[PDB]
Amino acid sequence: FGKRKGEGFGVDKREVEVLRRAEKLGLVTPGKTPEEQLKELFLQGKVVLYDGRTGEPIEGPIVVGQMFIMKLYHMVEDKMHARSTGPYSLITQQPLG
Amino acid sequence: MLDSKLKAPVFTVRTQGREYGEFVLEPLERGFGVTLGNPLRRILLSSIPGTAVTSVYIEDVLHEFSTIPGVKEDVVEIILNLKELVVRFLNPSLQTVTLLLKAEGPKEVKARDFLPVADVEIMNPDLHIATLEEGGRLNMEVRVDRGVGYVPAEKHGIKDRINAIPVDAVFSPVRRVAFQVEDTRLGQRTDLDKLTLRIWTDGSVTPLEALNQAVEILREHLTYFSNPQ
Amino acid sequence: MLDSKLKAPVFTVRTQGREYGEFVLEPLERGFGVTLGNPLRRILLSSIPGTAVTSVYIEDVLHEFSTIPGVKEDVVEIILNLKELVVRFLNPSLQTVTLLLKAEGPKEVKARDFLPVADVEIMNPDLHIATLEEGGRLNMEVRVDRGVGYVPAEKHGIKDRINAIPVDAVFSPVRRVAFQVEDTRLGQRTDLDKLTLRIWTDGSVTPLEALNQAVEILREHLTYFSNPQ
Amino acid sequence: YYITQVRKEKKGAGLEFATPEEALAAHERGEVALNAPIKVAGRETSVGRLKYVFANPDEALLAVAHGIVDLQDVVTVRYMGKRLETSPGRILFARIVAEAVEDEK
Amino acid sequence: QKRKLQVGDKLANRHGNKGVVAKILPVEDMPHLPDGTPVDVILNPLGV
């Protein structure tokens, strides 16, 4: 928010609006300025987020952050097996691949 | 004009280079900054066209997973660095431009080392392509195209030379969009929307240009409501 | 035209009466149905200006929580029934029209009982205002205005007569908007947006008309990006 | 769930509107001020009910969309034949079902 | 062969939240912060 201050702009209708629902919630000390309220709200680990599809905010602060996440190895089974017809065992006549 | 129409969106602009461009527009009625900023954003990211490396041909290399002697980086690392390269051509006549570069020995290969082409410009000169040691022979041909969105190297499969290897297409010239709707006070009523949207661009096009294209795509779409049925 | 432009938004319409009107338009690129439906919605509700009862003055009543003798309904129920009243004036010259009505004795007071005004029309004649018993004296003046969106009676606080009581503003011919973006399959690629938005209207204007006005307000706003500064 | 829940915020000064007419006014202004919430423990109607009354069903949600009333806020609304003191969300849920199967009643 | 992340894949943090990709959203419309930077992945709270 410091850069936001200098870059030239303040707070949204949206940012204020989610604050309203946030104090009614109990995340921000009623009576303090939005600038101060947002700090409180940030320290809690959550910030305001807008939808992306509608541009409106998501009522209520939502946490966000840098979480490490790994990708897991795909086993041979992962190669989804689909079989129509095929071989058959010699003594047992049931399907075999 | 004097009263309601002179009281009109003062479109103000602030742009440095071809990458960043802020755009303020106020006053606006109730909840309109949002009404406008959001669609333009959605457009600015999905709809606008650009340039990205679509194919590469190292001369002695056959597959993408090879390593070139005297060359610290591996083929995959370099093809990766190329995706980072941002070019800019000036007119439609340039659909597919093949940039050429060949450097030898103890030199660092940067994007400025590509032989100049008439209507094309390289905004990413100092980008690092590779570090050549000694007896380091690197001679390649990197294709470049004008497209839109993301196109996996698998989807296009470019075929300039049989030993060439396609690269993933990174076409939106727009890096990121951002818009704020802060209150503004105009005389009588205080509730007022002030819409300012910040646009970032790889250089191919400019923030302003982008924005213009954007609003047009929207306009063009608002016309599609013509013939009932 | 044949390839990319003939493949154009097939604007299809389905409207019954002046209240309901479905509108489908496909195909659209990626995430465009949303990019369009949403703004149009935001406009359809706030911008298509309208008319709503902005103030009321019962002659012997002082506060909103009072009850009138010979009158079954209480002031709050009646002021509520007035919010249900839909009027329609023909030209700008009519910004604030005060409709007058006075009825006595064993009669049912409906909206048709208001004395006719030259440029104003009441689409809601049979609406029920009150049930007068005997010695039932009800003489009032209900204000009417042209605005946009929702305006709490607290926000405006209208002042015609000192004992009058403001009412909440319900301003749009549009009752409710609704849009869906379901996938559609067009030959080659499957990812496709299909935008269909359902509009409901009080009857004053039609869904189609509304929509047209809407898109225009948007267009008109996209032009405001003309003169830099 | 979240859509249908109702909220309660701060009880400081008197919660008695069931009886005085000076109770409507005073706690209406006091709520406009900073002391009485829109959702206060005040038996009959917290000033949140005092402030807004919605005629038809839709009216209710419109105010919500405009930023007047959150969905979880305690409001009064006129349904088919009753003045029902129920929240926005709750009224909305009502419709979801009412719509899913058109036999509304 | 190069394996670029896809809907079939499974990713999981060191804590144990394991899960599969169900939808790759266009940066166009996924949750975005006030400054234009959008989120990469949206994890469900219920799993916690």
UniProtKB/Swiss-Prot annotation, chain A:
Signal peptide from the UniProt entry: none
Recorded superkingdom: Bacteria
Subunit details: The RNAP catalytic core consists of 2 alpha, 1 beta, 1 beta' and 1 omega subunit. When a sigma factor is associated with the core the holoenzyme is formed, which can initiate transcription.
Function field: DNA-dependent RNA polymerase catalyzes the transcription of DNA into RNA using the four ribonucleoside triphosphates as substrates.
Family: Belongs to the RNA polymerase beta chain family.
Protein name listed in UniProt: DNA-directed RNA polymerase subunit beta
Designated gene of the protein: rpoB
Residues of the full protein shown: 926 to 1022 of 1119
From Swiss-Prot, chains B, C:
Transmembrane segments: none
Homology family: Belongs to the RNA polymerase alpha chain family.
UniProt domain comment: The N-terminal domain is essential for RNAP assembly and basal transcription, whereas the C-terminal domain is involved in interaction with transcriptional regulators and with upstream promoter elements.
Protein's name in the database: DNA-directed RNA polymerase subunit alpha
UniProt keyword annotations, A-Z: DNA-directed RNA polymerase, Nucleotidyltransferase, Transcription, Transferase
EC number: 2.7.7.6
Subunit relationships: Homodimer. The RNAP catalytic core consists of 2 alpha, 1 beta, 1 beta' and 1 omega subunit. When a sigma factor is associated with the core the holoenzyme is formed, which can initiate transcription.
Catalyses which reaction(s): RNA(n) + a ribonucleoside 5'-triphosphate = RNA(n+1) + diphosphate
Protein species of origin: Thermus thermophilus (strain ATCC 27634 / DSM 579 / HB8)
Region of interest: Alpha N-terminal domain (alpha-NTD): 1-229
One GO molecular-function entry: DNA-directed RNA polymerase activity
Enzyme type, top EC level: transferase
Full-protein positions shown: 1 to 229 of 315
Biological process annotations from GO: DNA-templated transcription
Protein role: DNA-dependent RNA polymerase catalyzes the transcription of DNA into RNA using the four ribonucleoside triphosphates as substrates.
Entry GO CC: cytoplasm; DNA-directed RNA polymerase complex
UniProtKB/Swiss-Prot annotation, chain D:
Name of the protein described by the UniProt record: DNA-directed RNA polymerase subunit beta'
Entire-sequence positions represented here: 790 to 894 of 1524
Family under the similarity heading: Belongs to the RNA polymerase beta' chain family.
Subunit architecture: The RNAP catalytic core consists of 2 alpha, 1 beta, 1 beta' and 1 omega subunit. When a sigma factor is associated with the core the holoenzyme is formed, which can initiate transcription.
Source organism per UniProt: Thermus thermophilus (strain ATCC 27634 / DSM 579 / HB8)
Annotated function: DNA-dependent RNA polymerase catalyzes the transcription of DNA into RNA using the four ribonucleoside triphosphates as substrates.
Swiss-Prot record, chain E:
Signal sequence interval, chain numbering: none
Superkingdom, taxonomy of origin: Bacteria
Task of the protein: DNA-dependent RNA polymerase catalyzes the transcription of DNA into RNA using the four ribonucleoside triphosphates as substrates.
Quaternary state and interactors: The RNAP catalytic core consists of 2 alpha, 1 beta, 1 beta' and 1 omega subunit. When a sigma factor is associated with the core the holoenzyme is formed, which can initiate transcription.
Family indicated by similarity: Belongs to the RNA polymerase beta chain family.
Protein name: DNA-directed RNA polymerase subunit beta
Primary gene name: rpoB
Residue numbers of the full-length protein present here: 829 to 876 of 1119
